[PDB]
Symmetry: C2
Subunit: 158 residues, 2 copies
């Protein structure tokens, strides 16, 4: 299917992060508080894989990194209003990613788009740390940031 | 070195391997699993998508995250069943579900059963539109991978 870029891919910490958007989708179940397919403007996704620095956490380089907590913030240029969107983990036909249907609440124009990526909760995920079978890396304590300062929402491209 | 619990199983969209080896130290220490010191071994469920997993959007061979995996161990000759909640974690060789385990009934032959629940509807979603979505849906009853004659003969390390 057709995907449109949010901006240039980013490397931040042990993650390679891409941002794409396309038409709103129907999801099962419908996640969190996201707008329906009909009410949304688009679906936005964060593609997140481990880069070379990820190998120290035990991920295979290039593999999807699960259990992250990803939140997008959208802010139209010239506006003080910031939208906070919690992404959910989900599969499309092209595999696991984090994503959301979203509305651009201040309409057409240029937005700053910022993904804040928190590590797997210490309540949810662990690392082997023994010398024999363990890893020498550790999760990051403050969320990593991938952002694009000049994303143009010029309306549906579909 | 890793030791097999038994032959790998394919069940539904999942290829499931079970292995065990020496107890490990985990950060943070999961649930109420025994420490490296208290434990007999570490058991892991290695779970990747098989060909049928493509219908759910997975690439074949991909780790399948957000599952809930619980093991049941019953020594031959006993009516007692020990339940072990596995946790998701990384080792040097990647993401898996695992736990440190102490075999309450000790040395002997065990039935070992992994019950694998799909991601909570709370936790995970599928695109289901024709354009970008998948045709499969998650399973409702937990998938089972079971080995009837696992021989626990003590540390092999
Ligand atoms: Zn890329
Ligand atoms: Zn990459
Ligand atoms: Zn990269
Ligand atoms: Zn359902
Ligand atoms: Zn991907
Ligand atoms: Zn501007
Ligand atoms: Zn995609
Ligand atoms: Zn999506
Ligand atoms: Zn196999
Ligand atoms: Zn297989
Ligand atoms: Zn920590
Ligand atoms: Zn693996
Ligand atoms: Zn494997
Ligand atoms: Zn392993
Ligand atoms: Zn493990």
């Amino acid at each position: 299917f057709d995907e449109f870029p949010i901006g240039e891919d980013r490397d931040v910490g042990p993650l390679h992060v891409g941002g794409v958007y396309f038409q709103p989708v129907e999801m099962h179940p419908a996640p969190g508080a996201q707008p329906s397919k009909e009410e949304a403007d688009c679906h936005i996704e964060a593609d997140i894989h481990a880069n070379e620095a990820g190998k120290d956490l035990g991920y295979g380089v290039g593999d999807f990194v699960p259990y992250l907590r990803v939140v997008a913030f959208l802010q139209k240029h010239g506006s003080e209003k910031v939208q906070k969107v919690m992404f959910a983990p989900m599969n499309a036909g092209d595999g696991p990613h984090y994503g959301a249907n979203v509305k651009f609440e201040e309409g057409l124009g240029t937005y700053k788009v910022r993904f804040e990526i928190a590590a797997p909760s210490h309540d949810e995920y662990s690392l082997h740390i023994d010398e024999q079978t363990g890893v020498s890396g550790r999760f990051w304590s403050e969320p990593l940031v991938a952002e694009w300062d000049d994303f143009e929402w010029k309306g549906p491209q579909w």
